[PDB]
Amino acid sequence: KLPTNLAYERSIDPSDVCFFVVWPDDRKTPLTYNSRTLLGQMEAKSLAYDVSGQPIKSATAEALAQGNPHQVDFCHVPYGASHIECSFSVSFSSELRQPYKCNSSKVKQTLVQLVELYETKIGWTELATRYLMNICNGKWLWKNTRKAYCWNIVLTPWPWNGEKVGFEDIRTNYTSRQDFKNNKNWSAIVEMIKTAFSSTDGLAIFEVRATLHLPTNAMVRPSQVFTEKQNSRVFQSTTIDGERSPILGAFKTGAAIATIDDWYPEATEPLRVGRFGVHREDVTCYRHPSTGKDFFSILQQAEHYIEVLSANKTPAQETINDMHFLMANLIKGGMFQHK
Amino acid sequence: KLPTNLAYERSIDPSDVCFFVVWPDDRKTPLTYNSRTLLGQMEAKSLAYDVSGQPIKSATAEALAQGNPHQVDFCHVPYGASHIECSFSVSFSSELRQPYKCNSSKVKQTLVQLVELYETKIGWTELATRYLMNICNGKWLWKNTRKAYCWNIVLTPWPWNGEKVGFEDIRTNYTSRQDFKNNKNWSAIVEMIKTAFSSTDGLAIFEVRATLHLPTNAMVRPSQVFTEKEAAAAAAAATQNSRVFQSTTIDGERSPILGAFKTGAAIATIDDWYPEATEPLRVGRFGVHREDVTCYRHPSTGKDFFSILQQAEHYIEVLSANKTPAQETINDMHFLMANLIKGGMFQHKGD
Amino acid sequence: GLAIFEVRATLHLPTNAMVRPSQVFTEKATQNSRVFQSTTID
DNA sequence: ATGAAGCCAAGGCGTCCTGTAAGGCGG
DNA sequence: CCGCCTTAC
């Protein structure tokens, strides 16, 4: 088990989310930001106090009132703009079928058999639904939908015949899972993702466009640059029409689509799928390898699930949840090696 | 047999896949990439397992949730671009007609005799079609065809009188060996390869150009550098760039190039004559599968190139009599010739 | 929970009255005082 | 051509920087 | 087939 060289490639492939300002003339310009400098108060605890004790001695009432200046990148909607338009593309492929590199003829045939038995026993409906549900509710916008009047999403899928798929105001209409299974096009686009995960060289491309209705020169929140050793809050950028634009990441938009994991020990809300089910808000790992619900404890029991998935029938709280998690990690993952 | 110095120059000499962006406003620019630092999570099995199970909680539930930053080269299609134009050149010749090295008049006259008898008894059609099928179906783009809408090949042959021979949407139109065979130029280009291999001082140049239609902001996958690298751990550079691209300067600005040997490796992925044969292999000595790390034609099967070349004097007295069976022996002759077409260190005995 | 307000105020000032916008925090000898924070409209 | 271009105060913290393969030589 | 073997800005 864990044969020193075991890799998988991506099965979901998102891109950068290019922002545009739409004017009432129905012309589009790339959204632009500016690095402005600002004055704040001395508000750090480790400026008035020492190591967990008392006031330093020199942080006096006058010294704590000197305003400290900082520099931030500032992206707002320009005044008199109609709305914001966000555009990107997703690709669903069958690359979870067999590992990219395996280095072991036994673990390969085990994992190929497990994906086959999963596909046959439990349909792709759950995972496909879960992934599509947060491409059509605009979770990939992250914080731009919060403090927004309305946002509408339009899918142009491929291969396709018919007119574009449309989701209107996604606050009143499309709240729950049953709201998505409604009028026309849902079943026809959940199918073709199952086909994309079923067929060898099976491909389903979607090109997503969203319209944000924000208040008067409202604040836009793109994806920020890590680069460390001044400018706090540096924005990730690309060049459109020879001018700089914020982009809202390629890896961040994959993280949003893959917030499908609410099978971890109990459940509260979906996490970004990983090995040690990490949560970002509280800085703990759920599915920590002590619980025996991490990926390397479940993957090393592949034969057990091969034994259970053969005969009737799987208990739909423990085994199916673990198999969902395993497939969810295979759709993402690489690299599953050890020593 | 197998003298202390025998060698060969490769017959197929490709070099590069230079990428260009084309805007609707039909003008070409070099495709550019940027170094991008990104924040992953602690996902390696090594960080939460020593040997072979759990460590004492140094890798605690908090310590496994600290975001690990890395740096990667990121290349994608710029917004508002029509498609990617991929430029690439091949030159087929006849170096397989003579050993590059010396030291055995017997083996030298045996190999040139075998090439001549092979040529006459079973023509270059099989290897030529195999080498041209993967040049005209975008095998040399490697992964850029996957998750693409459409791609079209246009190759300018030489020496040639007529028009640039073109292959439309390949995913649908040109799937099987037959689909490539029933357009009006296939014969002529297979024949000028056969000419190149059969004739002395033979030359067949193909200037290939692939139009590739990718989705919005779609990611480009060029070739990557090797770079044996280590100074120490704390700290040469917190950054240490993972996934560095092989690049060249076009029109004064850097662009990813998708290798030259990598392109050559794509064309010579024809070998499906090995003991089991599911998929075609990179023509080599030990029929090594790079992914799924093993060797079909291991030198214990007795089907590697050094076992097969030691039955050359055998194949002379089988290509003379009538008639060579469609079973393994034609495949062995094909594999031997495919190796004379690429290789040139047929020496072992130490080297 | 969410509540969005669009607030509009109308100032009636005397003739050629001075408007007092935000001032820029500057890098920093040449002369310059009172640099204003600005945006692009029309 | 006639002369001058003023000053004052400051510049936050927390956390991290992945892992696999890939010897010659004498005995 | 088996063990011996080092230092880096």
mmCIF file with all atom_site columns, C-alpha atoms in Angstrom, chain A residues 23-208:
data_model
loop_
_atom_site.group_PDB
_atom_site.id
_atom_site.type_symbol
_atom_site.label_atom_id
_atom_site.label_alt_id
_atom_site.label_comp_id
_atom_site.label_asym_id
_atom_site.label_entity_id
_atom_site.label_seq_id
_atom_site.pdbx_PDB_ins_code
_atom_site.Cartn_x
_atom_site.Cartn_y
_atom_site.Cartn_z
_atom_site.occupancy
_atom_site.B_iso_or_equiv
_atom_site.pdbx_formal_charge
_atom_site.auth_seq_id
_atom_site.auth_comp_id
_atom_site.auth_asym_id
_atom_site.auth_atom_id
_atom_site.pdbx_PDB_model_num
ATOM 1   C CA . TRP A 1 23  ? -22.494 50.623 -18.457 1.00 0.00 ? 23  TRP A CA 1
ATOM 2   C CA . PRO A 1 24  ? -26.146 51.533 -19.352 1.00 0.00 ? 24  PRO A CA 1
ATOM 3   C CA . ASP A 1 25  ? -24.859 52.065 -22.984 1.00 0.00 ? 25  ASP A CA 1
ATOM 4   C CA . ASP A 1 26  ? -24.277 48.208 -22.894 1.00 0.00 ? 26  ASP A CA 1
ATOM 5   C CA . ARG A 1 27  ? -20.466 48.673 -23.429 1.00 0.00 ? 27  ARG A CA 1
ATOM 6   C CA . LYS A 1 28  ? -17.947 46.729 -21.219 1.00 0.00 ? 28  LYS A CA 1
ATOM 7   C CA . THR A 1 29  ? -14.616 47.983 -19.703 1.00 0.00 ? 29  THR A CA 1
ATOM 8   C CA . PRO A 1 30  ? -12.108 45.938 -17.619 1.00 0.00 ? 30  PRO A CA 1
ATOM 9   C CA . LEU A 1 31  ? -12.460 46.723 -13.842 1.00 0.00 ? 31  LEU A CA 1
ATOM 10  C CA . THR A 1 32  ? -9.386  48.656 -12.472 1.00 0.00 ? 32  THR A CA 1
ATOM 11  C CA . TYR A 1 33  ? -8.057  49.179 -8.872  1.00 0.00 ? 33  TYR A CA 1
ATOM 12  C CA . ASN A 1 34  ? -5.644  51.748 -7.275  1.00 0.00 ? 34  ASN A CA 1
ATOM 13  C CA . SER A 1 35  ? -3.044  51.437 -4.418  1.00 0.00 ? 35  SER A CA 1
ATOM 14  C CA . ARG A 1 36  ? -4.149  54.226 -1.967  1.00 0.00 ? 36  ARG A CA 1
ATOM 15  C CA . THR A 1 37  ? -2.438  54.973 1.424   1.00 0.00 ? 37  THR A CA 1
ATOM 16  C CA . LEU A 1 38  ? -4.501  55.541 4.637   1.00 0.00 ? 38  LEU A CA 1
ATOM 17  C CA . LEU A 1 39  ? -4.063  56.512 8.357   1.00 0.00 ? 39  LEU A CA 1
ATOM 18  C CA . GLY A 1 40  ? -5.215  54.145 11.183  1.00 0.00 ? 40  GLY A CA 1
ATOM 19  C CA . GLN A 1 41  ? -4.822  54.103 15.020  1.00 0.00 ? 41  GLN A CA 1
ATOM 20  C CA . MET A 1 42  ? -2.178  52.079 16.971  1.00 0.00 ? 42  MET A CA 1
ATOM 21  C CA . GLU A 1 43  ? -4.578  49.113 17.608  1.00 0.00 ? 43  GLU A CA 1
ATOM 22  C CA . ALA A 1 44  ? -2.190  46.064 17.983  1.00 0.00 ? 44  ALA A CA 1
ATOM 23  C CA . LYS A 1 45  ? -2.226  44.404 21.493  1.00 0.00 ? 45  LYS A CA 1
ATOM 24  C CA . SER A 1 46  ? 1.604   43.829 21.177  1.00 0.00 ? 46  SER A CA 1
ATOM 25  C CA . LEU A 1 47  ? 2.058   47.687 20.959  1.00 0.00 ? 47  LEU A CA 1
ATOM 26  C CA . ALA A 1 48  ? 0.365   48.756 24.290  1.00 0.00 ? 48  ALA A CA 1
ATOM 27  C CA . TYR A 1 49  ? 1.248   45.431 26.122  1.00 0.00 ? 49  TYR A CA 1
ATOM 28  C CA . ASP A 1 50  ? 4.377   43.164 26.348  1.00 0.00 ? 50  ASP A CA 1
ATOM 29  C CA . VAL A 1 51  ? 4.323   39.279 26.430  1.00 0.00 ? 51  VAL A CA 1
ATOM 30  C CA . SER A 1 52  ? 1.092   38.289 28.324  1.00 0.00 ? 52  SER A CA 1
ATOM 31  C CA . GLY A 1 53  ? 1.535   40.840 31.189  1.00 0.00 ? 53  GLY A CA 1
ATOM 32  C CA . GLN A 1 54  ? 0.861   44.626 31.520  1.00 0.00 ? 54  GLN A CA 1
ATOM 33  C CA . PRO A 1 55  ? 1.492   47.983 29.694  1.00 0.00 ? 55  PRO A CA 1
ATOM 34  C CA . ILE A 1 56  ? 5.112   48.181 28.328  1.00 0.00 ? 56  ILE A CA 1
ATOM 35  C CA . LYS A 1 57  ? 6.308   51.433 29.952  1.00 0.00 ? 57  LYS A CA 1
ATOM 36  C CA . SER A 1 58  ? 6.607   53.895 26.944  1.00 0.00 ? 58  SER A CA 1
ATOM 37  C CA . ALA A 1 59  ? 3.194   53.243 25.220  1.00 0.00 ? 59  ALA A CA 1
ATOM 38  C CA . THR A 1 60  ? 1.892   56.521 26.821  1.00 0.00 ? 60  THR A CA 1
ATOM 39  C CA . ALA A 1 61  ? -1.533  58.189 26.146  1.00 0.00 ? 61  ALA A CA 1
ATOM 40  C CA . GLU A 1 62  ? 0.169   60.503 23.523  1.00 0.00 ? 62  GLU A CA 1
ATOM 41  C CA . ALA A 1 63  ? 2.335   57.700 21.920  1.00 0.00 ? 63  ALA A CA 1
ATOM 42  C CA . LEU A 1 64  ? -0.808  55.475 21.377  1.00 0.00 ? 64  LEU A CA 1
ATOM 43  C CA . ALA A 1 65  ? -2.643  58.452 19.655  1.00 0.00 ? 65  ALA A CA 1
ATOM 44  C CA . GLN A 1 66  ? -0.014  58.928 16.831  1.00 0.00 ? 66  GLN A CA 1
ATOM 45  C CA . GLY A 1 67  ? -1.801  57.591 13.678  1.00 0.00 ? 67  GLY A CA 1
ATOM 46  C CA . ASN A 1 68  ? 0.130   54.770 11.868  1.00 0.00 ? 68  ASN A CA 1
ATOM 47  C CA . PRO A 1 69  ? -0.070  55.037 8.029   1.00 0.00 ? 69  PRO A CA 1
ATOM 48  C CA . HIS A 1 70  ? -0.517  51.931 5.755   1.00 0.00 ? 70  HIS A CA 1
ATOM 49  C CA . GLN A 1 71  ? -1.038  51.217 1.986   1.00 0.00 ? 71  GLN A CA 1
ATOM 50  C CA . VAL A 1 72  ? -3.849  49.001 0.483   1.00 0.00 ? 72  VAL A CA 1
ATOM 51  C CA . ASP A 1 73  ? -5.045  48.103 -3.077  1.00 0.00 ? 73  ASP A CA 1
ATOM 52  C CA . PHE A 1 74  ? -8.603  49.544 -3.523  1.00 0.00 ? 74  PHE A CA 1
ATOM 53  C CA . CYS A 1 75  ? -11.154 48.045 -6.021  1.00 0.00 ? 75  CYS A CA 1
ATOM 54  C CA . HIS A 1 76  ? -14.685 49.632 -6.132  1.00 0.00 ? 76  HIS A CA 1
ATOM 55  C CA . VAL A 1 77  ? -17.388 49.789 -8.898  1.00 0.00 ? 77  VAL A CA 1
ATOM 56  C CA . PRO A 1 78  ? -16.962 53.069 -10.901 1.00 0.00 ? 78  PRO A CA 1
ATOM 57  C CA . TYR A 1 79  ? -19.847 55.612 -10.426 1.00 0.00 ? 79  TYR A CA 1
ATOM 58  C CA . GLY A 1 80  ? -22.846 55.392 -12.843 1.00 0.00 ? 80  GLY A CA 1
ATOM 59  C CA . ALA A 1 81  ? -22.015 51.745 -13.834 1.00 0.00 ? 81  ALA A CA 1
ATOM 60  C CA . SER A 1 82  ? -25.042 49.439 -14.554 1.00 0.00 ? 82  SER A CA 1
ATOM 61  C CA . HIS A 1 83  ? -23.517 46.219 -13.032 1.00 0.00 ? 83  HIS A CA 1
ATOM 62  C CA . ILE A 1 84  ? -20.370 43.968 -12.734 1.00 0.00 ? 84  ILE A CA 1
ATOM 63  C CA . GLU A 1 85  ? -19.874 40.923 -15.076 1.00 0.00 ? 85  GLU A CA 1
ATOM 64  C CA . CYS A 1 86  ? -17.644 37.917 -14.052 1.00 0.00 ? 86  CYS A CA 1
ATOM 65  C CA . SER A 1 87  ? -16.532 35.296 -16.694 1.00 0.00 ? 87  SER A CA 1
ATOM 66  C CA . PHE A 1 88  ? -14.565 31.964 -16.434 1.00 0.00 ? 88  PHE A CA 1
ATOM 67  C CA . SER A 1 89  ? -14.571 28.329 -17.790 1.00 0.00 ? 89  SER A CA 1
ATOM 68  C CA . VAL A 1 90  ? -14.699 24.847 -16.069 1.00 0.00 ? 90  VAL A CA 1
ATOM 69  C CA . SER A 1 91  ? -13.701 21.441 -17.630 1.00 0.00 ? 91  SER A CA 1
ATOM 70  C CA . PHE A 1 92  ? -14.956 18.044 -16.236 1.00 0.00 ? 92  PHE A CA 1
ATOM 71  C CA . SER A 1 93  ? -12.768 15.042 -17.358 1.00 0.00 ? 93  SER A CA 1
ATOM 72  C CA . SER A 1 94  ? -12.520 11.252 -16.593 1.00 0.00 ? 94  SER A CA 1
ATOM 73  C CA . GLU A 1 95  ? -8.935  11.261 -15.136 1.00 0.00 ? 95  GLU A CA 1
ATOM 74  C CA . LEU A 1 96  ? -10.013 9.721  -11.738 1.00 0.00 ? 96  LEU A CA 1
ATOM 75  C CA . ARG A 1 97  ? -10.550 6.396  -13.704 1.00 0.00 ? 97  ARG A CA 1
ATOM 76  C CA . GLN A 1 98  ? -6.870  5.214  -13.445 1.00 0.00 ? 98  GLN A CA 1
ATOM 77  C CA . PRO A 1 99  ? -3.864  6.898  -11.705 1.00 0.00 ? 99  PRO A CA 1
ATOM 78  C CA . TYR A 1 100 ? -1.502  9.232  -13.708 1.00 0.00 ? 100 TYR A CA 1
ATOM 79  C CA . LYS A 1 101 ? 1.592   7.359  -12.331 1.00 0.00 ? 101 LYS A CA 1
ATOM 80  C CA . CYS A 1 102 ? 1.278   4.318  -9.931  1.00 0.00 ? 102 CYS A CA 1
ATOM 81  C CA . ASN A 1 103 ? 4.708   2.450  -9.830  1.00 0.00 ? 103 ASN A CA 1
ATOM 82  C CA . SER A 1 104 ? 2.742   -0.679 -8.619  1.00 0.00 ? 104 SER A CA 1
ATOM 83  C CA . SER A 1 105 ? 0.614   -3.018 -10.861 1.00 0.00 ? 105 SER A CA 1
ATOM 84  C CA . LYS A 1 106 ? -1.445  -4.197 -7.778  1.00 0.00 ? 106 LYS A CA 1
ATOM 85  C CA . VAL A 1 107 ? -2.506  -0.812 -6.186  1.00 0.00 ? 107 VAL A CA 1
ATOM 86  C CA . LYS A 1 108 ? -3.328  0.454  -9.764  1.00 0.00 ? 108 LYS A CA 1
ATOM 87  C CA . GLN A 1 109 ? -5.739  -2.477 -10.547 1.00 0.00 ? 109 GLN A CA 1
ATOM 88  C CA . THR A 1 110 ? -7.260  -2.091 -6.987  1.00 0.00 ? 110 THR A CA 1
ATOM 89  C CA . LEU A 1 111 ? -7.993  1.674  -7.534  1.00 0.00 ? 111 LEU A CA 1
ATOM 90  C CA . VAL A 1 112 ? -9.242  1.097  -11.173 1.00 0.00 ? 112 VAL A CA 1
ATOM 91  C CA . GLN A 1 113 ? -11.593 -1.688 -9.819  1.00 0.00 ? 113 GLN A CA 1
ATOM 92  C CA . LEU A 1 114 ? -12.752 0.576  -6.887  1.00 0.00 ? 114 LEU A CA 1
ATOM 93  C CA . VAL A 1 115 ? -13.656 3.529  -9.256  1.00 0.00 ? 115 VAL A CA 1
ATOM 94  C CA . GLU A 1 116 ? -15.474 0.991  -11.561 1.00 0.00 ? 116 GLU A CA 1
ATOM 95  C CA . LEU A 1 117 ? -17.415 -0.568 -8.585  1.00 0.00 ? 117 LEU A CA 1
ATOM 96  C CA . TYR A 1 118 ? -18.225 2.962  -7.194  1.00 0.00 ? 118 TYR A CA 1
ATOM 97  C CA . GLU A 1 119 ? -19.577 4.082  -10.660 1.00 0.00 ? 119 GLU A CA 1
ATOM 98  C CA . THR A 1 120 ? -21.747 0.876  -10.947 1.00 0.00 ? 120 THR A CA 1
ATOM 99  C CA . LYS A 1 121 ? -23.019 0.703  -7.288  1.00 0.00 ? 121 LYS A CA 1
ATOM 100 C CA . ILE A 1 122 ? -23.382 4.474  -6.392  1.00 0.00 ? 122 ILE A CA 1
ATOM 101 C CA . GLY A 1 123 ? -24.151 6.838  -9.356  1.00 0.00 ? 123 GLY A CA 1
ATOM 102 C CA . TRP A 1 124 ? -22.129 10.073 -10.001 1.00 0.00 ? 124 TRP A CA 1
ATOM 103 C CA . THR A 1 125 ? -25.463 11.969 -9.321  1.00 0.00 ? 125 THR A CA 1
ATOM 104 C CA . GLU A 1 126 ? -24.425 13.029 -5.732  1.00 0.00 ? 126 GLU A CA 1
ATOM 105 C CA . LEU A 1 127 ? -20.857 14.327 -6.547  1.00 0.00 ? 127 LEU A CA 1
ATOM 106 C CA . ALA A 1 128 ? -21.952 15.770 -9.983  1.00 0.00 ? 128 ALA A CA 1
ATOM 107 C CA . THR A 1 129 ? -24.971 17.519 -8.282  1.00 0.00 ? 129 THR A CA 1
ATOM 108 C CA . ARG A 1 130 ? -22.714 18.795 -5.396  1.00 0.00 ? 130 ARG A CA 1
ATOM 109 C CA . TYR A 1 131 ? -20.078 20.242 -7.861  1.00 0.00 ? 131 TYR A CA 1
ATOM 110 C CA . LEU A 1 132 ? -22.704 21.777 -10.268 1.00 0.00 ? 132 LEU A CA 1
ATOM 111 C CA . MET A 1 133 ? -24.786 23.189 -7.306  1.00 0.00 ? 133 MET A CA 1
ATOM 112 C CA . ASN A 1 134 ? -21.992 25.718 -6.327  1.00 0.00 ? 134 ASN A CA 1
ATOM 113 C CA . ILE A 1 135 ? -21.166 26.698 -9.983  1.00 0.00 ? 135 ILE A CA 1
ATOM 114 C CA . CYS A 1 136 ? -24.895 27.685 -10.474 1.00 0.00 ? 136 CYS A CA 1
ATOM 115 C CA . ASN A 1 137 ? -25.286 29.465 -7.027  1.00 0.00 ? 137 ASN A CA 1
ATOM 116 C CA . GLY A 1 138 ? -22.100 31.603 -7.604  1.00 0.00 ? 138 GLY A CA 1
ATOM 117 C CA . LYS A 1 139 ? -20.013 30.373 -4.593  1.00 0.00 ? 139 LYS A CA 1
ATOM 118 C CA . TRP A 1 140 ? -16.865 31.046 -6.775  1.00 0.00 ? 140 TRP A CA 1
ATOM 119 C CA . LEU A 1 141 ? -17.524 34.846 -6.189  1.00 0.00 ? 141 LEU A CA 1
ATOM 120 C CA . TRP A 1 142 ? -16.779 34.132 -2.438  1.00 0.00 ? 142 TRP A CA 1
ATOM 121 C CA . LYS A 1 143 ? -17.685 37.544 -0.808  1.00 0.00 ? 143 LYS A CA 1
ATOM 122 C CA . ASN A 1 144 ? -18.993 39.666 -3.795  1.00 0.00 ? 144 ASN A CA 1
ATOM 123 C CA . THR A 1 145 ? -22.536 38.091 -3.453  1.00 0.00 ? 145 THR A CA 1
ATOM 124 C CA . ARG A 1 146 ? -22.647 39.249 0.242   1.00 0.00 ? 146 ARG A CA 1
ATOM 125 C CA . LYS A 1 147 ? -23.912 42.917 0.340   1.00 0.00 ? 147 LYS A CA 1
ATOM 126 C CA . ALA A 1 148 ? -25.219 42.566 -3.289  1.00 0.00 ? 148 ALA A CA 1
ATOM 127 C CA . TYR A 1 149 ? -28.837 43.278 -4.486  1.00 0.00 ? 149 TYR A CA 1
ATOM 128 C CA . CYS A 1 150 ? -28.976 40.484 -7.142  1.00 0.00 ? 150 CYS A CA 1
ATOM 129 C CA . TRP A 1 151 ? -26.651 38.088 -9.073  1.00 0.00 ? 151 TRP A CA 1
ATOM 130 C CA . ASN A 1 152 ? -27.677 36.063 -12.208 1.00 0.00 ? 152 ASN A CA 1
ATOM 131 C CA . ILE A 1 153 ? -25.584 33.139 -13.666 1.00 0.00 ? 153 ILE A CA 1
ATOM 132 C CA . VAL A 1 154 ? -25.618 31.939 -17.354 1.00 0.00 ? 154 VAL A CA 1
ATOM 133 C CA . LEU A 1 155 ? -23.976 28.586 -18.407 1.00 0.00 ? 155 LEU A CA 1
ATOM 134 C CA . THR A 1 156 ? -22.954 27.859 -22.061 1.00 0.00 ? 156 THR A CA 1
ATOM 135 C CA . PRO A 1 157 ? -22.011 24.124 -21.860 1.00 0.00 ? 157 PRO A CA 1
ATOM 136 C CA . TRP A 1 158 ? -20.266 21.822 -24.439 1.00 0.00 ? 158 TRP A CA 1
ATOM 137 C CA . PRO A 1 159 ? -20.930 19.483 -26.139 1.00 0.00 ? 159 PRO A CA 1
ATOM 138 C CA . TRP A 1 160 ? -24.443 21.083 -26.358 1.00 0.00 ? 160 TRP A CA 1
ATOM 139 C CA . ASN A 1 161 ? -27.482 21.703 -28.638 1.00 0.00 ? 161 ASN A CA 1
ATOM 140 C CA . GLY A 1 162 ? -30.076 24.291 -27.431 1.00 0.00 ? 162 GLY A CA 1
ATOM 141 C CA . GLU A 1 163 ? -30.047 27.820 -25.853 1.00 0.00 ? 163 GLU A CA 1
ATOM 142 C CA . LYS A 1 164 ? -27.832 28.841 -22.825 1.00 0.00 ? 164 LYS A CA 1
ATOM 143 C CA . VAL A 1 165 ? -28.820 27.659 -19.264 1.00 0.00 ? 165 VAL A CA 1
ATOM 144 C CA . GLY A 1 166 ? -29.965 30.562 -16.981 1.00 0.00 ? 166 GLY A CA 1
ATOM 145 C CA . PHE A 1 167 ? -30.266 30.958 -13.154 1.00 0.00 ? 167 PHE A CA 1
ATOM 146 C CA . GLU A 1 168 ? -32.028 34.277 -12.197 1.00 0.00 ? 168 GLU A CA 1
ATOM 147 C CA . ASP A 1 169 ? -31.742 36.101 -8.766  1.00 0.00 ? 169 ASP A CA 1
ATOM 148 C CA . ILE A 1 170 ? -29.913 33.416 -6.635  1.00 0.00 ? 170 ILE A CA 1
ATOM 149 C CA . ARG A 1 171 ? -31.257 34.521 -3.181  1.00 0.00 ? 171 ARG A CA 1
ATOM 150 C CA . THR A 1 172 ? -35.114 34.175 -3.554  1.00 0.00 ? 172 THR A CA 1
ATOM 151 C CA . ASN A 1 173 ? -35.251 31.511 -6.377  1.00 0.00 ? 173 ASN A CA 1
ATOM 152 C CA . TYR A 1 174 ? -32.285 29.053 -5.979  1.00 0.00 ? 174 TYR A CA 1
ATOM 153 C CA . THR A 1 175 ? -31.861 28.618 -2.155  1.00 0.00 ? 175 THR A CA 1
ATOM 154 C CA . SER A 1 176 ? -32.255 24.786 -1.703  1.00 0.00 ? 176 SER A CA 1
ATOM 155 C CA . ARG A 1 177 ? -31.335 21.595 -3.713  1.00 0.00 ? 177 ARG A CA 1
ATOM 156 C CA . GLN A 1 178 ? -34.984 21.025 -4.924  1.00 0.00 ? 178 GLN A CA 1
ATOM 157 C CA . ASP A 1 179 ? -34.968 24.635 -6.375  1.00 0.00 ? 179 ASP A CA 1
ATOM 158 C CA . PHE A 1 180 ? -32.185 23.448 -8.816  1.00 0.00 ? 180 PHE A CA 1
ATOM 159 C CA . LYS A 1 181 ? -34.049 20.238 -9.984  1.00 0.00 ? 181 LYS A CA 1
ATOM 160 C CA . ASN A 1 182 ? -36.738 22.627 -11.471 1.00 0.00 ? 182 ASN A CA 1
ATOM 161 C CA . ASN A 1 183 ? -38.029 23.657 -14.857 1.00 0.00 ? 183 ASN A CA 1
ATOM 162 C CA . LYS A 1 184 ? -35.897 22.559 -17.852 1.00 0.00 ? 184 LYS A CA 1
ATOM 163 C CA . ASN A 1 185 ? -32.111 22.145 -18.204 1.00 0.00 ? 185 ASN A CA 1
ATOM 164 C CA . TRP A 1 186 ? -30.876 20.752 -14.773 1.00 0.00 ? 186 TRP A CA 1
ATOM 165 C CA . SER A 1 187 ? -31.075 16.943 -15.489 1.00 0.00 ? 187 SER A CA 1
ATOM 166 C CA . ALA A 1 188 ? -29.541 17.484 -19.015 1.00 0.00 ? 188 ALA A CA 1
ATOM 167 C CA . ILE A 1 189 ? -26.353 19.172 -17.509 1.00 0.00 ? 189 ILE A CA 1
ATOM 168 C CA . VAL A 1 190 ? -26.043 16.900 -14.364 1.00 0.00 ? 190 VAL A CA 1
ATOM 169 C CA . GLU A 1 191 ? -26.051 14.168 -17.075 1.00 0.00 ? 191 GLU A CA 1
ATOM 170 C CA . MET A 1 192 ? -22.949 14.820 -19.339 1.00 0.00 ? 192 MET A CA 1
ATOM 171 C CA . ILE A 1 193 ? -20.935 15.382 -16.055 1.00 0.00 ? 193 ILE A CA 1
ATOM 172 C CA . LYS A 1 194 ? -21.782 11.729 -15.074 1.00 0.00 ? 194 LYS A CA 1
ATOM 173 C CA . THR A 1 195 ? -20.896 10.855 -18.751 1.00 0.00 ? 195 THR A CA 1
ATOM 174 C CA . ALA A 1 196 ? -17.679 12.986 -18.313 1.00 0.00 ? 196 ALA A CA 1
ATOM 175 C CA . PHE A 1 197 ? -16.754 10.853 -15.185 1.00 0.00 ? 197 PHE A CA 1
ATOM 176 C CA . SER A 1 198 ? -18.037 7.530  -16.778 1.00 0.00 ? 198 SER A CA 1
ATOM 177 C CA . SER A 1 199 ? -16.541 7.512  -20.356 1.00 0.00 ? 199 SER A CA 1
ATOM 178 C CA . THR A 1 200 ? -12.746 7.157  -21.039 1.00 0.00 ? 200 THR A CA 1
ATOM 179 C CA . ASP A 1 201 ? -11.738 10.458 -22.801 1.00 0.00 ? 201 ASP A CA 1
ATOM 180 C CA . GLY A 1 202 ? -15.113 11.775 -21.442 1.00 0.00 ? 202 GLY A CA 1
ATOM 181 C CA . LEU A 1 203 ? -15.134 15.633 -21.457 1.00 0.00 ? 203 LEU A CA 1
ATOM 182 C CA . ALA A 1 204 ? -17.743 18.277 -20.392 1.00 0.00 ? 204 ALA A CA 1
ATOM 183 C CA . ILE A 1 205 ? -16.677 21.988 -20.750 1.00 0.00 ? 205 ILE A CA 1
ATOM 184 C CA . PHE A 1 206 ? -18.850 24.800 -19.230 1.00 0.00 ? 206 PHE A CA 1
ATOM 185 C CA . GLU A 1 207 ? -18.285 28.590 -19.760 1.00 0.00 ? 207 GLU A CA 1
ATOM 186 C CA . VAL A 1 208 ? -19.918 30.491 -16.811 1.00 0.00 ? 208 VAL A CA 1
#
